[PDB]
Design a protein around this ligand. Sequence first.
Ligand SMILES: Cn1cc(C(=O)Nc2cccc(C(=O)O)c2)ccc1=O
Length: 119
Amino acid sequence: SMRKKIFKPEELRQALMPTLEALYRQDPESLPFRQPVDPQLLGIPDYFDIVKNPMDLSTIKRKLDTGQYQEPWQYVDDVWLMFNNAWLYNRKTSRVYKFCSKLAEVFEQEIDPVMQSLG
Ligand SMILES: Cn1cc(C(=O)Nc2cccc(C(=O)O)c2)ccc1=O
């Protein structure tokens, strides 16, 4: 069958970290994504009922820093999970939803040349 895990996790860390840094540079749009959603703090007790697999920038960063991503698409999947969770949970008219859309646009712009560099 197909080859798997051809890149070292540390090669993926080096190649992909600039795309994550681009998200962190978005001010104010990254602020709601820097830390895990806290439903008690935010007064949204249904959050974990709706969002079964939460994700945020700090979790992605720690996974990439520590070499937990073994394939480039696993990193992409977690970034998309973060955005899809926020689009699912929040009203389309909301500030967090709009900020999510901004981060997603930045991510798409940054990820395509990096994925090409892994080709
Ligand atoms: C991803 N996400 C985030 C929030 C949120 O408001 N988080 C938060 C937590 C601390 C600070 C800040 C800040 O904007 O300063 C934001 C609410 C729903 C949601 O889906």
